[PDB]
Amino acid sequence: RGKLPPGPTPLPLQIGIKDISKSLTNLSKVYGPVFTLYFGLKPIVVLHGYEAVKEALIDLGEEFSGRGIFPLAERANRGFGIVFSNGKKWKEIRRFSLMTLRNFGMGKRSIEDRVQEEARCLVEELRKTKASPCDPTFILGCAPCNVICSIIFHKRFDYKDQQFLNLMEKLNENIKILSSPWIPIIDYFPGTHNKLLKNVAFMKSYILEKVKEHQESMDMNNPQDFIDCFLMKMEKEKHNQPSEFTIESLENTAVDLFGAGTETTSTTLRYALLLLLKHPEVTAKVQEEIERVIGRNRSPCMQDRSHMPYTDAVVHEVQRYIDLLPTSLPHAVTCDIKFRNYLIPKGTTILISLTSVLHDNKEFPNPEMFDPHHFLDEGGNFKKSKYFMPFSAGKRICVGEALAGMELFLFLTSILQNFNLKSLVDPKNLDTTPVVNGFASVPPFYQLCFIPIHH
Ligand code: HEM
Ligand SMILES: C[C@H](C(=O)O)c1ccc(-c2ccccc2)c(F)c1
């Protein structure tokens, strides 16, 4: 009936995602690019190497577009948003969300507009540290969060506003819980499964409040944010019950956007500054390029990227090098499907090795080294690659891809346009080793001084 790929016999201190990825790569050398692992009677089919990831996620896109159940089901019922939903519900909600994020049905103000404003605020906030040692963790967190608040409720907060601090506190808690290391089984239980449930309840409740206020002034000719756009969809979906668009669904999708769009961006920003401190020659050329293409008066805009190949290679290289989500989020096949000499049954969990693609040693010689030239051709031009999959690939590719690319490019250039980065430790001694984490490559702690730029 099914015939899964071969693998090690069943069941294969604190172990992180990077350790797991390393294990998966070692296993691919034994069993090949496609293999099965079992954790109990639970089989997980692993895809390793670009060719197998492409053939599955891209060439059989639909069949591999399902979401893998995960280490639990969340009776909070997370399955009504985008991240953990499946089927028809996922299909319509993901589509709606993609298009709204691409400026459709959200008013005339652009997404870039919002990101440029936050960029300006991020710079002002960084000026407030008065060039004294700073751990940028918090400030780099507020920026991405505020862009999602602006897109979802049409509101951005001061980084000192309690409401805003509360949302981030809850998000950080859930993220730290969901990404705890393993030791067989996850590692969290103490008093946690309930904090996850409660914090989510709190967040949904906070959003529902905003939803209630939007319903008061809802106007079919004036949506200006994600909530208006969603409420206008429900409107058009009435007389066609049961719709996938409901208040429960709007709040869960809103919660997904916050969770998926805050920490990933924030961690990549923090990792980028750390790689910039570590490689002062790279930073200097980014600053040179910023200086000659944009100058220091006007704010950076997305059109500048095509004229700044070194900086574009640097942003790509940060994402490629750090391998933020080594195994993406788990997938599942949507029906029984023949894949090479195998027969995978509907619902089988599929684990993708993004590390195996981002760190392919033939596409990116010396893949373990940080090097902007992994994205530069032999003439120094920007070189795009089919192996650049930090956002994954296929039908489940990060719905926030465009938004995240804008945040990384605009925030990084804004920061480098206004400040020189000064590391306390001598770069040569600066340790860039990732801290153990269950789902993500996270950078170690560091501080730096944001010194108003000078020459
Ligand atoms: C540097 C930043 C980011 C990176 C590297 C990143 C990466 C990813 C990856 C690897 C996935 C899993 C894809 C899969 O299942 O195969 C994903 C999912 C997703 N991301 Fe992002 N992401 C980032 C930021 C964003 C932003 C800014 C948003 C907000 C709009 C966002 C929203 C989501 C959502 C909602 C999902 C789930 C999509 C689905 O299941 O269909 N992400 N992201
Ligand atoms: C807050 C919410 C939750 O279910 O707890 C939630 C929402 C989205 C993410 C998420 C994180 C990184 C990539 C894709 C999704 C997440 F880790 C947590």
From Swiss-Prot:
Q: What reaction does this enzyme carry out catalytically?
A: an organic molecule + reduced [NADPH--hemoprotein reductase] + O2 = an alcohol + oxidized [NADPH--hemoprotein reductase] + H2O + H(+); (5Z,8Z,11Z,14Z)-eicosatetraenoate + reduced [NADPH--hemoprotein reductase] + O2 = (8R,9S)-epoxy-(5Z,11Z,14Z)-eicosatrienoate + oxidized [NADPH--hemoprotein reductase] + H2O + H(+); (5Z,8Z,11Z,14Z)-eicosatetraenoate + reduced [NADPH--hemoprotein reductase] + O2 = (8S,9R)-epoxy-(5Z,11Z,14Z)-eicosatrienoate + oxidized [NADPH--hemoprotein reductase] + H2O + H(+); (5Z,8Z,11Z,14Z)-eicosatetraenoate + reduced [NADPH--hemoprotein reductase] + O2 = (11R,12S)-epoxy-(5Z,8Z,14Z)-eicosatrienoate + oxidized [NADPH--hemoprotein reductase] + H2O + H(+)
Q: What is its EC number?
A: 1.14.14.1, 1.14.14.53, 1.14.14.51, 1.14.14.52
What is the protein's major site of localization?
Answer: endoplasmic reticulum
* Annotated effect of mutating residue 298 to W: In allele CYP2C9*11
- Similarity comment text for this entry: Belongs to the cytochrome P450 family.
What does the UniProt keyword field contain? Answer: Endoplasmic reticulum, Heme, Iron, Lipid metabolism, Membrane, Metal-binding, Microsome, Monooxygenase, Oxidoreductase, Steroid metabolism, Sterol metabolism
Q: What is the effect of changing residue 235 to G?
A: In allele CYP2C9*10
Q: Which organism is it from?
A: Homo sapiens
Q: Iron: present as a keyword of the record?
A: yes
**Cofactor field:** heme
Effect caused by changing residue 452 to S:
In allele CYP2C9*12
Keyword Membrane among record annotations: yes
Protein name listed in UniProt: Cytochrome P450 2C9
Provide the transmembrane region boundaries: none
Name the Pfam families on file: p450
Q: Which GO terms describe its cellular component?
A: cytoplasm; endoplasmic reticulum membrane; intracellular membrane-bounded organelle; plasma membrane
**Source lineage:** Eukaryota, Metazoa, Chordata, Craniata, Vertebrata
Q: What induces it?
A: By rifampicin.
* GO MF annotations in UniProt: (R)-limonene 6-monooxygenase activity; (S)-limonene 6-monooxygenase activity; (S)-limonene 7-monooxygenase activity; arachidonate 11,12-epoxygenase activity; arachidonate 14,15-epoxygenase activity; arachidonate epoxygenase activity; caffeine oxidase activity; estrogen 2-hydroxylase activity
The record gives the membrane topology as: Peripheral membrane protein
Question: Which residues are heme-binding?
Answer: 398
Q: Where in the cell is it found?
A: Endoplasmic reticulum membrane; Microsome membrane
PROSITE patterns in the cross-refs: CYTOCHROME_P450
One GO biological process term:
monoterpenoid metabolic process
Known pathway: Lipid metabolism; arachidonate metabolism; Steroid metabolism; cholesterol metabolism; Terpene metabolism; (4R)-limonene degradation
